[PDB]
């Protein structure tokens, strides 16, 4: 019976994710960082931080 | 009632007729150069603006011859109403 | 090195020769006189330019010899690649495969191009990690990102065999796999290597671009394409059958809308029928009606015949065409040539074919050319010319013409020798 | 030697990105447009006089180009024919007997009539 | 083109088994990489047949397309010209040669007036032979 | 539409409510007689009482023939099947004649189809079971739906059951179930769900708009010879079918039985409503003897179509025939079937009229001067020919830098471009 | 066009044309007959042999392991 009739709780509703950067509605997320962005800019800009932050911490 | 079933008519014939129009390697070229129906089911016109766009030139052949998940508050301070962000 | 396209008998023909105020000029664009047909042909290019008049049918009719075939030549090269033009011979229709009609309106719809836009999204990049729930990893020279993978996606993914260096785009409003090569590595170099493999540089940009495409095609592509589940393939054997009216009123109403909501353009060309009057009574008919469509051609016509006989009637009719279709067209005529424009054209001849002769080479074969035809002068300055560089000569004399006038005869003298020795041919 | 194996693979590469198909699968994609079954098996008797397979050619020293082509041939057919075999078998199969009818064998005597009134 | 052609058994095999259904072949003499300039001769003709219609396809419309009734059919013209163009592109490249040649049609007087009328268009053509 | 062809000023026969026709009205001129006629026609269209009436459009060239069939057409709206043929067509090489006769016969003859389907449709929020004691046993599954407007509970039977599983129907699943079957269908997930990081293309949908409770109206309008090709060929024996060429067939007179009893029964159950329509063949004296003869029984039919025949021919020799000469191409026999009307030539002043309704359909400027001498051209000459010289005059005009056509342009072009007449005489020089 | 009585050598000089051009340049020889194919029409019997008698010599390097 739970096999075929499973009480699925409804899905939640995604996050819209935004551009840290440009603060544009979010297209990419990156694969190091996880942080998603909107623009080629926001890229350089989000691994020139990533690298700078990385070697701050160690 | 039941329809009559003959035998095979067997037809003999030499090796030689089915080695036929049989050319040597060394006498076929890559014909598949003029081969144009068979790029239909490939390939695209746009696709193939792309290639020969993007074809690697020979310099570069002879040249060639860290995740974590962070959080974007981690990395990036927010940016205060009425402002434009800028990283 | 011998192309495939080598000197024809309209190699020299490079348009109408015809200024702004479309006057003639003489010798221009390789054309030497006929002013008035000339000038009448520019006009019929200005209204197949315009597009806005469909079926509309002209008959360039005159003698033999007289640059009928010269002025559609004319038009076709004056007239841009971009807009159609089909040329057909009228024995050209009478196929096993279709009916007459049915050659006839797969030839009105071959002459109008369908200039169809679509614009995509797509992303493309190169395949940095796969992992099958499932993740996906993309870049390019400016961005790398990362996606989830639904059911479809992951099985198109292992279906195509996307590996990890592999050019793939998918486009999004179907979400379709097409793998444009594997870039080119220090690691990925082989020995051999398979037909499929192709080396392609990382894509640029950003993974998801916008597209703007436009394709063109033709109403009987169109119709084609839809006659049948693999249809496209009769576009290269010509096996297309006779395509059902449903598919063609169905084709022409889908256009329409096409054109309304701005996506398709109409590029209304030419079918040029030489020796139209091959067609028969059946053929003519169909004319009569199929050039009273909206989707109709610009229709251009050339004949030499007098008062014929209509095939397919014991009826005599000028230029072999019924009446009825006759008032359906305009008529342009053109005349034989003077001494000045067959020595022109002979000239013009000489510089495509790359002959040098001599002035006196000139006068004499211009007399030939106006005593027995211009097509036997013109043969006539290749063959003195292979004659002269027998000779070890560079340029073409009056004594090599009247070599080449010894060895190839015209029509006239083959038919009075022939006349001479009748008894021996056949069936006279 | 490296530079003779670069010139062979950027002549092959040049080649094989040179050339854009006549029509392309986007153009076709975008000019696309959007009971007797039961009288049937009662009539269906004919069975062909004759039958014989097909005739076989023979030979001594089969080529191997040939016998290969032919072997991946069948494996290409019936590998197709696999998801539909049951259907290409009924849809083949020709109608080789003929049984009489069962009714037949009440029909042939009386007595078989008679007792099939009294029965029922 | 990565094409691979086993031509058969090597011959030093051949007592391996004393009953074997296979095709022993010798060893072969030269080197293993073989490099040869050859030229083929093709006509025009053979590319449009070629290109009428799909060949050596492994999907099942192909393979019917193997298994049915062999007929000429209509090439169009528009088949003619892609592969006029695809010759003339590798006559530029160097690795194609045009050659053109003759044709000879004895007892023409058996054309009927349409096929001489058709003749007209394609004796007066640029790509017609001699 | 936009190009403008032969006829494209032709918007109907200009008739007043009295059936007499106005002296230049609806893009026609003259030709009243012709014209009261065609539009007696175009009653007996609309009253759909009869079938197979028979009319002949009969006179000189040019004298607006097909004008007036296309002006029937236009008279009868797009509902009406008006289907065009010429005699030529019959000579096809897949079927023969009668069968290509039959066959526009049937096209046109018009059905419209109109389907009344109950649908709810929604994004699933619930499935839950309704669980009770059998008289784990169910009596009701719960299924509720969200669209923009609202959301519903629906009781539904506990056998869709099996539906919703081989769906795989899920919460945030757009689906919807017909009333009639009760068999749910499932569309994808709700787009609220979809993040631009996942990639899926089919498998998304946006939230239905409207009442989640719907009720569809389907209308869709075919020929009885659609209905002949759909059961003549449905669409392994397919893929054989679709590699093969697929020819015409000479569909045999037991389907059209079996379609006209199915067409008869869905008119009976108010689904569909014939619209009979008009068959219009022009240069029917292409026909042949065994077409005519076909046409004889053709036309006494009970389910023919109202048919329009045009000819030119004047007493001529019947094709397929030797030494037959017809009153019209046509043999007295179909004659005797046909109603005739005549057509007239026209006046100078008509061909004026008509060539200026025709500049100003091409969007020409022309003096008065101009339309006078190209008035008199189609005096001489012909009609057809002088409307030809408009638009080549208009563009010798613009290339002259003059915005409308002078008399010097109309007689440069009539210069350039000759008659039928005129080159027939040079032709005898 | 070459012309004349029956036996007067116009095959034969044919032939010595197509012997003196060789074997790389083709010649097609056909009849006047052979358009009446029952398959295609008769122009394109023609438009065949006007394509035959065009040659494309196809010159590769194979290399073969
Ligand atoms: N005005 C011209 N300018 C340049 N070349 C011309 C001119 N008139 C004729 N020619 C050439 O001379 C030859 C004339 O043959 P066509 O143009 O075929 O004449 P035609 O009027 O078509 O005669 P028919 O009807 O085909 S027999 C061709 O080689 C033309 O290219
Ligand atoms: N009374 C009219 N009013 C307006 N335009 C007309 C009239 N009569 C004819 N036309 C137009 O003039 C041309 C000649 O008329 P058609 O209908 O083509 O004549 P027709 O009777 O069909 O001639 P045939 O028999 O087919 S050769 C067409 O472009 C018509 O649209
Ligand atoms: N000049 C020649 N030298 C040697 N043999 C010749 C010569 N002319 C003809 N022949 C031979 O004699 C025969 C004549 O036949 P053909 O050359 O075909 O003449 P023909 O004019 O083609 O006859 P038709 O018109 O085809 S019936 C053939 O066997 C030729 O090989
Ligand atoms: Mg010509
Ligand atoms: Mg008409
Ligand atoms: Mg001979």
């Given at each position: 019976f739970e096999?075929?009739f499973?009480?699925g709780?409804?899905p939640?509703?995604?996050?819209?994710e935004?551009?840290?950067?440009?603060?544009?509605?979010?297209?990419?997320?990156?694969?190091?960082?996880?942080?998603?962005?909107?623009?080629?800019?926001?890229?350089?800009?989000?691994?020139?931080?990533?690298?700078?932050?990385?070697?701050?911490?160690? | 009632?039941?329809?009559?079933?003959?035998?095979?008519?067997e037809?003999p014939?030499?090796?030689?007729?089915?080695?036929?129009?049989?050319?040597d390697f060394?006498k076929?070229?890559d014909?598949?150069?003029?081969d144009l129906?068979?790029?239909?089911?490939?390939?695209?016109?746009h696709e193939?603006?792309?290639?020969?766009?993007?074809?690697?030139?020979?310099?570069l052949?002879?040249?060639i011859?860290?995740?974590?998940?962070?959080?974007?508050?981690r990395?990036?301070?927010?940016?205060?109403?009425?402002?434009?962000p800028?990283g | 090195?011998?192309?495939?396209?080598?000197?024809?008998?309209?190699?020299?023909?490079?348009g109408?020769?015809?200024?702004?105020?479309?006057?003639?000029?003489?010798?221009?664009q390789?054309?030497?006189g006929?002013?008035?047909?000339?000038?009448?042909?520019?006009?019929?290019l200005?209204?197949?330019?315009?597009?806005?008049?469909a079926?509309?049918?002209?008959?360039?009719?005159?003698?033999?010899?007289?640059?009928?075939?010269?002025?559609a030549?004319?038009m076709?090269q004056?007239?841009?690649?971009?807009?159609?033009?089909?040329?057909?011979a009228?024995?050209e229709?009478?196929?096993?495969?279709?009916?007459?009609?049915?050659?006839?309106?797969?030839?009105f719809?071959?002459?109008?191009?369908?200039?169809?836009?679509?614009?995509?999204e797509?992303?493309?990049?190169?395949?940095?990690?796969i992992?099958?729930?499932?993740?996906?990893?993309?870049?390019?020279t400016?961005?790398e990102?990362?996606?989830?993978?639904?059911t479809?996606?992951?099985?198109?993914?292992?279906?195509?065999?996307?590996?990890?260096?592999?050019?793939?785009?998918?486009?999004?409003?179907?979400?379709?796999?097409?793998?444009?090569?594997?870039?080119?590595?220090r690691?990925?170099?082989?020995?051999?290597?398979?037909?499929?493999?192709?080396?392609?540089?990382?894509?640029?940009?950003?993974?998801?671009?916008?597209?703007?495409?436009?394709?063109?095609?033709?109403?009987?592509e169109?119709d084609?394409?839809?006659?049948?589940?693999?249809?496209?393939?009769?576009?290269?054997?010509?096996?297309?059958?006779?395509?059902?009216?449903?598919?063609?009123?169905?084709?022409?109403?889908?256009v329409?809308?096409?054109?309304?909501?701005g996506k398709?353009?109409?590029?209304?060309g030419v079918?040029?029928?030489?020796?139209?009057?091959m067609?028969?009574?059946?053929s003519?008919?169909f004319?009569?009606?199929?050039?009273?469509?909206?989707?109709?051609?610009?229709?251009?016509?050339?004949?030499?015949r007098?008062?014929?006989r209509?095939?397919?009637t014991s009826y005599?009719?000028?230029?072999?065409?019924?009446?009825?279709?006759?008032?359906?067209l305009?008529?342009?005529s053109?005349?034989?040539?003077?001494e000045?424009?067959?020595?022109?054209?002979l000239?013009?001849?000489?510089?495509?074919?790359?002959?040098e002769?001599?002035?006196?080479?000139?006068t004499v074969?211009?007399?030939?050319?106006?005593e027995?035809?211009?097509?036997?002068?013109?043969?006539?300055?290749?063959?003195?010319?292979?004659?002269?560089?027998?000779?070890?000569?560079?340029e073409?004399?009056?004594?090599?013409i009247?070599?080449?006038?010894?060895?190839f005869?015209?029509?006239?003298?083959?038919?009075?020798?022939?006349?001479?020795?009748?008894?021996?041919?056949?069936?006279? | 030697?490296?530079k003779?194996?670069?010139?062979q693979?950027?002549?092959?590469n040049?080649?094989?990105?040179?050339?854009?198909?006549?029509y392309?699968?986007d153009?076709?994609?975008?000019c696309?447009?959007?009971?007797?079954?039961?009288?049937?098996?009662?009539?269906?008797?004919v069975?062909?006089?004759?039958?014989?397979?097909?005739?076989?050619?023979?030979?001594?020293?089969?080529p191997?180009?040939?016998?290969?082509?032919?072997?991946?041939?069948?494996?290409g057919?019936?590998?197709?024919?696999?998801?539909?075999?049951?259907?290409?078998?009924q849809?083949?199969?020709?109608?080789?007997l003929?049984?009489?009818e069962?009714?037949?064998?009440?029909?042939d005597?009386?007595?078989?009539?008679?007792?099939?009134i009294?029965?029922? | 083109?990565?094409?691979?052609?086993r031509?058969?058994?090597?011959?030093?095999?051949?007592?391996?088994?004393?009953?074997?259904?296979?095709e022993?072949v010798?060893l072969?003499?030269?080197?293993?990489?073989?490099?040869?300039?050859?030229?083929?001769?093709?006509?025009?003709?053979?590319?449009?047949?070629?290109?009428?219609?799909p060949?050596?396809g492994?999907?099942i419309?192909?393979?019917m397309?193997?298994?049915?009734?062999?007929?000429?059919?209509?090439?169009?013209?528009?088949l003619?010209?892609?592969?006029?163009?695809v010759?003339n592109?590798?006559?530029?490249q160097?690795?194609?040669?045009?050659?053109?040649?003759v044709?000879?049609?004895?007892?023409?007087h058996?054309?009927?007036?349409?096929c001489?009328?058709?003749?007209?268009?394609?004796?007066?053509?640029?790509?017609?032979?001699? | 539409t936009?190009?403008?062809?032969?006829?494209?000023?032709?918007?109907?026969?200009?008739?007043?409510?009295?059936?007499?026709?106005?002296?230049?009205?609806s893009?026609?001129?003259?030709?009243?007689?012709?014209?009261?006629?065609c539009?007696?026609?175009?009653?007996?269209?609309?009253?759909k009482?009869?079938?197979?009436?028979?009319?002949?459009?009969?006179?000189?060239?040019?004298t607006?023939?097909?004008?007036?069939?296309?002006?029937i057409?236009?008279?009868?709206?797009?509902?009406?099947?008006?289907c065009?043929?010429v005699?030529?067509?019959?000579?096809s090489?897949?079927?023969?004649?009668?069968?290509?006769?039959?066959?526009?016969?049937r096209?046109?003859?018009?059905?419209?189809?109109?389907?009344?389907?109950?649908?709810?449709?929604?994004?699933?929020?619930?499935?839950?079971?309704?669980?009770?004691?059998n008289?784990?046993?169910?009596?009701?599954?719960?299924?509720?739906?969200?669209?923009a407007?609202?959301?519903?509970?629906?009781?539904?039977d506990?056998?869709?059951?099996?539906?919703?599983?081989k769906?795989r129907?899920?919460?945030?699943?757009?689906?919807?179930?017909?009333?009639?079957?009760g068999?749910?269908?499932?569309?994808g997930?709700?787009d609220?769900?979809?993040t631009?990081?996942?990639?899926?293309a089919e498998?998304?949908?946006?939230?239905?708009?409207?009442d989640?409770?719907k009720?569809?109206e389907?209308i869709?309008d075919?020929?009885?010879?659609?209905?002949?090709?759909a059961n003549?060929?449905?669409?392994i024996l397919?893929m054989?079918?679709?590699?093969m060429?697929?020819?015409?067939?000479?569909?045999?007179?037991?389907?059209?039985?079996e379609?006209?009893?199915?067409?008869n029964?869905?008119?009976?159950?108010?689904?569909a409503?014939?619209?009979?329509?008009?068959?219009?063949?022009?240069?029917?004296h292409?026909?042949?003897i065994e077409?005519?003869?076909?046409?004889?029984?053709?036309?006494?039919?009970?389910?023919?179509?109202?048919?329009?025949?045009?000819?030119?021919?004047?007493?001529?020799?019947?094709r397929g025939?030797?030494?037959?000469?017809?009153?019209?191409?046509?043999?007295?026999?179909?004659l005797?079937?046909?109603?005739?009307?005549?057509t007239?030539?026209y006046?100078p002043?008509?061909?004026?009229?008509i060539?200026?309704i025709?500049?100003?359909?091409?969007?020409?400027?022309?003096?008065?001067?101009?339309?006078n001498h190209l008035?008199?051209?189609?005096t001489?000459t012909?009609?057809?020919?002088?409307?030809?010289?408009?638009?080549?005059?208009?563009?010798?005009?613009?290339?002259?830098?003059?915005?409308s056509?002078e008399?010097?342009?109309?007689?440069?072009?009539?210069?350039?471009?000759y008659?039928?007449?005129?080159?027939?005489?040079?032709?005898a020089?």
């Open positions: 096999e075929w499973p009480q709780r409804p939640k509703v995604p996050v819209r935004v551009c840290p950067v440009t603060h544009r509605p979010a297209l990419y997320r990156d694969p190091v960082t996880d942080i998603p962005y909107a623009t080629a800019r926001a890229f350089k800009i989000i691994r020139e931080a990533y690298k700078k932050y990385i070697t701050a911490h160690g | 009632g039941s329809s009559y079933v003959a035998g095979p008519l037809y014939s030499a090796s030689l007729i089915l080695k036929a129009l049989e050319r060394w076929e070229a014909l598949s150069m003029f129906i068979g790029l239909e089911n490939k390939i695209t016109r193939a603006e792309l290639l020969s766009k993007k074809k690697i030139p020979r310099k052949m002879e040249e011859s860290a995740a974590a998940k962070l959080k974007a508050s990395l990036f301070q927010p940016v205060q109403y009425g402002q434009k800028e | 090195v011998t192309r495939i396209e080598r000197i024809g008998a309209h190699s020299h023909i490079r109408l020769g015809l200024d702004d105020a479309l006057e003639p000029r003489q010798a221009s390789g054309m030497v006929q002013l008035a047909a000339r000038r009448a042909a520019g006009v019929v200005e209204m197949i330019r315009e597009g806005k008049i079926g509309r049918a002209v008959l360039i009719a005159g003698q033999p010899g007289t640059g009928k075939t010269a002025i030549m004319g076709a004056a007239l841009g690649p971009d807009t159609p033009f089909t040329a057909i009228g024995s229709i009478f196929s096993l495969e279709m009916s007459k009609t049915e050659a006839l309106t797969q030839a719809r071959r002459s109008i191009g369908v200039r169809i836009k679509e614009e995509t797509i992303i493309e990049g190169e395949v940095v990690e992992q099958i729930v499932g993740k996906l990893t993309l870049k390019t400016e961005m990102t990362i996606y989830d993978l639904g479809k996606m992951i099985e198109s993914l292992t279906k195509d065999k996307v590996q990890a260096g592999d050019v793939i785009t998918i486009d999004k409003a179907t979400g379709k796999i097409s793998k444009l090569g594997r870039s080119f590595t690691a990925r170099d082989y020995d051999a290597m398979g037909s499929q493999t192709k080396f392609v540089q990382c894509p640029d940009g950003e993974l998801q671009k916008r597209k703007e495409v436009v394709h063109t095609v033709s109403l009987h169109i084609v394409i839809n006659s049948r589940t693999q249809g496209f393939l009769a576009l290269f054997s010509g096996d297309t059958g006779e395509i059902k009216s449903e598919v063609r009123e169905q084709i022409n109403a889908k329409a809308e096409w054109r309304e909501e398709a353009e109409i590029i209304p079918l040029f029928i030489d020796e139209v009057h067609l028969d009574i059946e003519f008919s004319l009569n009606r199929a050039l009273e469509s909206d989707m109709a051609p610009v229709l251009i016509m050339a004949t030499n007098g008062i014929t209509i095939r397919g005599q009719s000028p230029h072999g065409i019924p009446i009825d279709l006759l008032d359906r305009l008529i342009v053109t005349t034989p040539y003077s000045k424009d067959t020595k022109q054209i000239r013009i001849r000489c510089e495509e074919e790359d002959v002769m001599s002035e006196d080479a000139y074969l211009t007399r030939i050319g106006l027995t035809s211009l097509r036997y002068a013109i043969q006539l300055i290749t063959a003195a010319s292979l004659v002269c560089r027998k000779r070890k000569g560079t073409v004399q009056v004594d090599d009247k070599r080449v006038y010894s060895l005869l015209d029509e006239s003298r083959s038919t009075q020798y022939m006349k001479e020795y009748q008894d021996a041919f056949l069936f006279n | 030697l490296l003779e194996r670069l010139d693979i950027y002549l092959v040049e080649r094989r990105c040179s050339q854009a198909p006549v392309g699968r153009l076709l994609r975008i696309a447009l959007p009971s007797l079954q039961d009288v049937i098996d009662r009539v269906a008797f069975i062909p006089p004759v039958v014989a397979a097909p005739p076989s050619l023979r030979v001594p020293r089969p191997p180009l040939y016998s290969h082509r032919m072997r991946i041939l069948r494996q057919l019936r590998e197709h024919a696999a998801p539909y075999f049951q259907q290409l078998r849809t083949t199969a020709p109608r080789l003929q049984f009489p069962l009714r037949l064998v009440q029909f005597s009386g007595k078989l009539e008679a007792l099939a009294l029965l029922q | 083109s990565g094409a691979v052609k031509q058969g058994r090597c011959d030093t095999y051949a007592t391996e088994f004393d009953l074997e259904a296979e022993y010798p072969p003499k030269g080197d293993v990489h073989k490099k040869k300039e050859i030229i083929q001769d093709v006509t025009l003709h053979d590319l449009d047949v070629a290109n009428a219609r060949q050596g492994q999907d419309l192909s393979m397309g193997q298994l049915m009734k062999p007929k000429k059919t209509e090439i169009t013209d528009k003619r010209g892609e592969i006029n163009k010759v592109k590798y006559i530029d160097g690795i194609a040669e045009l050659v053109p040649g044709l000879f049609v004895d007892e023409v058996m054309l009927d007036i349409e001489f009328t058709y003749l007209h268009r394609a004796l007066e053509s640029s790509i017609a032979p001699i | 936009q190009r403008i062809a032969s006829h494209s000023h032709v918007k109907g026969l200009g008739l007043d409510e009295s059936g007499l026709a106005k002296q230049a009205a893009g026609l001129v003259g030709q009243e007689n012709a014209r009261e006629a539009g007696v026609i175009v009653e007996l269209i609309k009253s009482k009869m079938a197979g009436r028979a009319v002949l459009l009969a006179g000189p060239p040019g607006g023939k097909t004008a007036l069939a296309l002006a057409a236009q008279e009868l709206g797009s509902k009406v099947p008006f065009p043929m005699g030529s067509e019959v000579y090489t897949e079927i023969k004649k009668t069968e290509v006769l039959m066959e526009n016969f096209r046109a003859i018009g059905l419209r189809i109109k389907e009344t389907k109950e649908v709810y449709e929604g994004e699933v929020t619930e499935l839950t079971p309704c669980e009770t004691e008289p784990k046993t169910i009596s009701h599954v719960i299924i509720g739906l969200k669209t407007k609202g959301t519903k509970q629906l009781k539904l506990p056998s869709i059951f099996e539906s919703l599983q769906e129907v899920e919460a945030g699943d757009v689906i919807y179930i017909e009333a009639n079957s068999a749910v269908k499932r569309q997930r709700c609220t769900y979809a631009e990081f996942d990639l899926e498998e998304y949908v946006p939230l239905p708009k409207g989640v409770h009720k569809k389907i869709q075919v020929t009885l010879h659609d209905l002949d090709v003549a060929r449905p669409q397919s054989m079918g679709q590699l060429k697929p020819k015409k067939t000479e569909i045999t007179d037991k389907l059209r039985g379609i006209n009893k199915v067409v029964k869905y008119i009976d159950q108010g689904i409503e014939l619209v009979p329509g008009v068959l219009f063949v022009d240069e029917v292409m026909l042949d077409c005519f003869t076909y046409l004889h029984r053709a036309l006494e039919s009970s389910i023919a179509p109202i048919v329009i025949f045009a000819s030119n021919r004047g007493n001529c020799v019947i025939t030797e030494d037959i000469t017809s009153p019209h191409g046509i043999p007295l026999d179909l005797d079937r046909v109603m005739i009307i005549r007239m030539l006046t002043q008509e061909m004026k009229q060539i200026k025709r500049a100003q359909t091409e969007g020409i400027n022309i003096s008065e001067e101009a339309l008035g008199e051209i189609g001489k012909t009609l057809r020919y002088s409307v030809q010289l408009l638009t080549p005059a208009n563009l010798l005009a613009k290339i002259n830098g003059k915005d056509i008399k010097e342009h109309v007689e440069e072009i009539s210069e350039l471009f008659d039928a007449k005129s080159s027939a005489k040079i032709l020089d």
